[PDB]
Amino acid sequence: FDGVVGPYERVAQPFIPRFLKREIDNKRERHAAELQRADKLIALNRYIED
Amino acid sequence: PTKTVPVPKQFWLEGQTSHMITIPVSILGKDLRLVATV
Amino acid sequence: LPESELAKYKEYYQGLKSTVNEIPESVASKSPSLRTLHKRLQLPNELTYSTLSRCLTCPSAKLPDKINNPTKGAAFVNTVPTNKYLDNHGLNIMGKNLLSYHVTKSIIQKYPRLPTVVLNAAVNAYISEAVLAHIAKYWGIEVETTSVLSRYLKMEPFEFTLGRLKFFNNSLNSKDGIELITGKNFSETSALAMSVRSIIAAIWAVTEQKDSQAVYRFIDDHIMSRKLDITKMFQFEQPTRELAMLCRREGLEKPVSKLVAESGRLSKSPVFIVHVFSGEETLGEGYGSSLKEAKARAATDALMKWYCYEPLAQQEPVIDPGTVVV
Amino acid sequence: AVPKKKVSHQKKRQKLYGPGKKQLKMIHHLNKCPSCGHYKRANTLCMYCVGQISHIWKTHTAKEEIKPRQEEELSELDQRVLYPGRRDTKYTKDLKDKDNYLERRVRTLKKD
Amino acid sequence: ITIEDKLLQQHIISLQQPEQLASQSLLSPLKREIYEANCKINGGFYKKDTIVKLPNSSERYKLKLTKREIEVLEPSVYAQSYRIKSSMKKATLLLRLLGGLDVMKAISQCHFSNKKIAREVAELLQKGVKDGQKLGLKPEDLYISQIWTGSDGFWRKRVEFKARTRIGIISHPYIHVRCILRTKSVTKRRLAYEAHLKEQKRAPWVQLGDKPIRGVTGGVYKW
RNA sequence: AUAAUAAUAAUAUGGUAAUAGAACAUUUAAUGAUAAUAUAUAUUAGUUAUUAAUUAAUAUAUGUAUUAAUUAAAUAGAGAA
RNA sequence: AGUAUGAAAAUGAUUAUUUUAUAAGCAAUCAUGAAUAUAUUAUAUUAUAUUAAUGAUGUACCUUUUGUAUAAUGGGUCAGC
RNA sequence: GUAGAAUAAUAGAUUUGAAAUAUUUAUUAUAUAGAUUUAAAGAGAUAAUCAUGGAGUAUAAUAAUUAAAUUUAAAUUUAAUAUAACUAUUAAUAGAAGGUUACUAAUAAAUUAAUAAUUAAUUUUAAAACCUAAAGGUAAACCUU
Numbered sequence A: 001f002d003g004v005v006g007p008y009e010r011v012a013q014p015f016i017p018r019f020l021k022r023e024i025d026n027k028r029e030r031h032a033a034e035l036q037r038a039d040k041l042i043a044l045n046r047y048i049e050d
Numbered sequence B: 001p002t003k004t005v006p007v008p009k010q011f012w013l014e015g016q017t018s019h020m021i022t023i024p025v026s027i028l029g030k031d032l033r034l035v036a037t038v
Numbered sequence C: 001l002p003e004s005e006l007a008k009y010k011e012y013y014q015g016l017k018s019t020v021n022e023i024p025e026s027v028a029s030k031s032p033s034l035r036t037l038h039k040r041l042q043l044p045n046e047l048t049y050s051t052l053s054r055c056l057t058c059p060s061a062k063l064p065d066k067i068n069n070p071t072k073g074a075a076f077v078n079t080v081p082t083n084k085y086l087d088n089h090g091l092n093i094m095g096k097n098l099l100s101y102h103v104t105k106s107i108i109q110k111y112p113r114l115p116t117v118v119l120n121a122a123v124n125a126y127i128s129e130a131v132l133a134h135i136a137k138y139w140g141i142e143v144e145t146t147s148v149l150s151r152y153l154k155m156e157p158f159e160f161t162l163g164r165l166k167f168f169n170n171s172l173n174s175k176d177g178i179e180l181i182t183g184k185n186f187s188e189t190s191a192l193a194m195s196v197r198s199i200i201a202a203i204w205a206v207t208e209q210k211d212s213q214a215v216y217r218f219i220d221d222h223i224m225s226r227k228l229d230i231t232k233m234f235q236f237e238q239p240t241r242e243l244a245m246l247c248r249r250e251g252l253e254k255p256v257s258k259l260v261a262e263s264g265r266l267s268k269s270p271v272f273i274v275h276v277f278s279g280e281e282t283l284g285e286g287y288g289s290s291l292k293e294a295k296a297r298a299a300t301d302a303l304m305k306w307y308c309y310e311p312l313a314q315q316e317p318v319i320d321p322g323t324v325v326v
Numbered sequence D: 001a002v003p004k005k006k007v008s009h010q011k012k013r014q015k016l017y018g019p020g021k022k023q024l025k026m027i028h029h030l031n032k033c034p035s036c037g038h039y040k041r042a043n044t045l046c047m048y049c050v051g052q053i054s055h056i057w058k059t060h061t062a063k064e065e066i067k068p069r070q071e072e073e074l075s076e077l078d079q080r081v082l083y084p085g086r087r088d089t090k091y092t093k094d095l096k097d098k099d100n101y102l103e104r105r106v107r108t109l110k111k112d
Numbered sequence E: 001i002t003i004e005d006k007l008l009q010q011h012i013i014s015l016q017q018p019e020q021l022a023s024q025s026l027l028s029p030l031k032r033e034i035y036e037a038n039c040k041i042n043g044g045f046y047k048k049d050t051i052v053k054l055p056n057s058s059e060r061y062k063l064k065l066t067k068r069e070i071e072v073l074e075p076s077v078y079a080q081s082y083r084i085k086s087s088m089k090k091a092t093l094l095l096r097l098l099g100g101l102d103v104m105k106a107i108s109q110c111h112f113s114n115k116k117i118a119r120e121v122a123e124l125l126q127k128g129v130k131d132g133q134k135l136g137l138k139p140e141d142l143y144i145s146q147i148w149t150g151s152d153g154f155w156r157k158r159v160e161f162k163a164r165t166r167i168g169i170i171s172h173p174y175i176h177v178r179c180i181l182r183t184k185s186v187t188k189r190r191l192a193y194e195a196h197l198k199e200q201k202r203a204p205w206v207q208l209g210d211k212p213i214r215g216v217t218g219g220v221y222k223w
Numbered sequence F: 001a002u003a004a005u006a007a008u009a010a011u012a013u014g015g016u017a018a019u020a021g022a023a024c025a026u027u028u029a030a031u032g033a034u035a036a037u038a039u040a041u042a043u044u045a046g047u048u049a050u051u052a053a054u055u056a057a058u059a060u061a062u063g064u065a066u067u068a069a070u071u072a073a074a075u076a077g078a079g080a081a
Numbered sequence G: 001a002g003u004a005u006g007a008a009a010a011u012g013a014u015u016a017u018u019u020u021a022u023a024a025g026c027a028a029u030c031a032u033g034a035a036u037a038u039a040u041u042a043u044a045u046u047a048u049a050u051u052a053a054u055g056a057u058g059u060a061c062c063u064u065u066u067g068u069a070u071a072a073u074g075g076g077u078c079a080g081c
Numbered sequence H: 001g002u003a004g005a006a007u008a009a010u011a012g013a014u015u016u017g018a019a020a021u022a023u024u025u026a027u028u029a030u031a032u033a034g035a036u037u038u039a040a041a042g043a044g045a046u047a048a049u050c051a052u053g054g055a056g057u058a059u060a061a062u063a064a065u066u067a068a069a070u071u072u073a074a075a076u077u078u079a080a081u082a083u084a085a086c087u088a089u090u091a092a093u094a095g096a097a098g099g100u101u102a103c104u105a106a107u108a109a110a111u112u113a114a115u116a117a118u119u120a121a122u123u124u125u126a127a128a129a130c131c132u133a134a135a136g137g138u139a140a141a142c143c144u145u
Ligand SMILES: [Mg+2]
Pocket: none
C-alpha cells in the first residue's frame, strides 16, 4: 500500500536507557504531584491566616 | 466512536487530501440505548 | 454537614500558634523529645523546658513572597508564625559571642604566638557554622519536616512540635535536583548552629550567678574537646627569610642551614638531613629528597617550633610579640 | 584432533581480536576524484565517473531494437486475440522483482 | 493526487514519539531551563556545582544531577539497523574499526570496506546522520560514541547430513547493528574537562612520600 | 516442685556407615484482621549469631494476600543417574 | 503449540571503573598499598562498595575405594522436570 | 525599590621595613655522572547499556444473570452458573457414524399448552451424491450390471 499503512520507519530518536527513562519520568511525575499538593497547602494556609 | 486511520488511495473518497481520514467503529447494542429527549 | 473539618483544622492551627507564642511550661514538660535532650546533655536543672523549646525556635515572623512560587521552586508549609519576643534570635547572638570569646581564649592559652590568620582558622574550625550544625545533629535536634496539615491529620499533640526545631524550612527544596538558592535564614545548617548557640546562651543565663564558669566547662566538654591538629593549619611562603627575621628580632645568632647526614645522592630518591643552626643551638631539623627541599623543611620546622610553643599551666601567662613580618 | 576443554571467553577473544593481522585496517589511502571532488581509492578510477562514461557510450553505441515489421501495425483487439497475457509462476514473479535481490552502486561522500 | 501528507506524519509521530531531543523530553520545564542556563554558563556542557540565575526573574538555582542523568542529557542520536543476514562475529569484525570515529569518516571507511555488512552499516550511519540533522545537530559534530551488535530474533536451525550416519546442525544467524552518535561539541568536551580535573587532582610522586606504615602496631613501640 | 531469661562452678560439643532430637524454605486445606502511606516480586545498601526474615531507596505489578499464627498434609528443597 | 507479561540464568556485542606487556599453577581466602564510585550528620585524619600492586596460605567437586590432585567414575553452561 | 552600618574579596593612593640563609627564594635551559618511572594491541574482575532466550508471574468466553460487600443511584470486587475441559468419588437417568469430492448432499406441517407472531412438548413429513468383507467385482471413494 505504498507504505501509507504498515510499519513507519522510526522517528529521529535520541538514546535514552530504558530503565533510566522509567526512573526520571517517575521522579518528574512525583515532583509535579508535590507541587500541586504544595500549592494546595499554601492556599489552605492563606485561608487560615486571618 | 470514530477512529482516525490512514487509508490508501484505493479507498479514498472524492475530496480526501491527506491519507488521514476519520471512520466509524462498530458498537455493541449493549452499550447504546433507544431515544424518542428520552 | 455534620462535620466542618476545615473549622476543626483551623482551631487546631490556632491552638498550635498560641502554644508557640507562649511555650507553656506544662506542655514543654509533657514533650518527650525535649526531656530526652535535657537528659542527654546533662543540662543544669535551673534550665527549664520552656527555655529549651525557645532555643529550638528560630525567628519566623512573616511568610515570604517566595512561598507563592512553588512552581518556581520553593514552598514553606511546615512552619507557624513565631512570637517576636519569644524566639532564639537574642539568645543566639549571646551564644555566638560566648563561643568567640571562650574558644579563642582557650586557643591562646594553648598556643601563645599563633599567627593571627592561623588562630582565626583554628577558631573557625572549632566553631564554624557547619561544625555547629553537625554537633546539633549529633545531639539529636531534629527539624520540623512535616506540614501543619499533615500533623493535624496524624493527630499529634503540640508537645512534639515544640520538641522539634522550628524555622522557615523549604519543603520541596531539593526535589528533582533543583535547589532554590536563598539567604542564610532558610538553611538547615544555619538553624542548627543557631539552636546550638541558643542552648549555650540559655545555660549562661541560668548559671550566671550560682556557678559562673559552668557554661565554660560545658563548652570545654563539648566544643573544646574536639581534636584539631594545629600543625596542619600552617602554610609558609619563603620561610627561611621569616626565620632570619625572627632571629634578628630575638637575641639569636644568624641562622645557617648545615648538612648533618646525607645518603643516596645521585639517585631517584636521596635523603639529606639539614639542621638550621644558630651558633650551637640547633633551631630546626629538616629532611629532604633535595638539598633545597631539606633546607626549606628545616626552616618550616623552626617556624613551627617558634609558633606552636605550648607552655604549661604552672608558667606565668606568656604573651608573644605578635607575628613576624617580612 | 579435538579440543580438550571449552575455550574460555578470554582466550578466544585474544586469539581473534588480539593480533594486528586479524584486525581491519583503516583505509587511509583514498583521495579526491579529479572529475567531481568526491572520495575515491588511491591509484584507482572513480567508480561514478567511469560508470557515467559507460552509460553515455551505451546511449550512443545503442544497438537498434529490432522490432518486428508486422507487430507495429497490429490492431490492439487483434493483438489481444493473438497474445493473451498469462499469469506468471511464483519463481518468475520473484525473478521480476529485481530490486528485492539486486544492488545498485552507492555514491561516495564529497571530499574536503 | 500527490502525497507521502503532514497529517499522516503527525499521526505517525503520535504513534511513536516526538522528534525532540532528550534534554527537552526528559526534564520538567523549569528544570530544563536551569540545565540550559548551566550549559550556557559552562560552554556547552553541565558542570558539577554552578549557581545559575535564570534570564527572566531574579531567583537563583543550583542543579544537582546524577552521573547517569548527565550522560543521558548530552545530545545524542540513536540509530538501529534492520535484520541483517550476518553473524555477530562478522559484524563486530568491522564494527571494532569504527569505535570513536567521526560519523563521516566512519561512513567513508564503510564505503570502501570490502565486506557485505559494511554497506548496511554505512546506510545505518547515514540514517543516523539524517536523524541528527532533523532533530538539531550538525553532521560535522557527530562522532560514533559507541556501536554494537546484538543477535536478532529467530535463527532457523537446519540439519546438515554428513557422511556415514553423522548429523550437523547448521544455523543461519541474523543480527542487528545499533549505534549511538554523540557530539564533539558537548560530550567530548565534557569528558576532556573531566580528564583534566582528574589530572589536576592527581597527587604528585614524592621521593620521600609519607607511605603509611602498613600493618598492625601490636600495642608496643618498636621505636 | 513450672516456664521464660540472666548469672556462678563444672563436664561435654571432629566425624564416614549408622541412630536420636530440633528447626527453616516451598505448595495446598481449615480458621483469619488489615490496606495504593498497602502489597507482591526483583536490584542495591543496611539490620538480627543470618539455608531465613526484616529495614531504606529504587523499578514493575495489583483495588489487593489461603497474608501473621496454630493445625492438617504434601508431586516439600538437586552440581551429580 | 492458549493470551498477556518477562531486570531469571546461561550466551553475544558495547561502554565505564579499575588491574594488567620481567611474569608461571583450582583463580579463592587472609593480609595490604593505590585508584575510582556512592553517601542530605564525610565534623575527618570519614564509611561503605568496586578493582588479579604487593605478600602469605591454598593439589576442583562428586562417586567408589585399604587409599584419589590423580593420568580412576561422572558432568559443556544455564533454566525446568 | 532606596539609604545607612558589619565583614570578606579585588583595585588604587599614601606610608612601610630590608643590602633581606638569591655561590637558588621563585623558574628556564644545556651538558656529565648516576638512579629510576611511564604502556594497553589485547585481556581479567565489577558494573551498566543493547540484545538473545523464555524460566518465572498473572490470567483461562469476560459476557449475561443471581446474592453479598464497597463507594455515587451507577459502577468495582467477591462467590455460583454456559453451547465451552478432562480426572476421581457419590446420587439419579439411560443403554450409543466416519470419510471422499462435488452436477454441494436443502425441508415442510399439524396438534396441545403457554401468551396474531411466539417458545416448549407431542407428532407426521421432504431431501440425503460416492466409499466404508458379503447386486458382482476392484488397486476405498472406481468400474460393471
Ligand atoms: Mg523475544
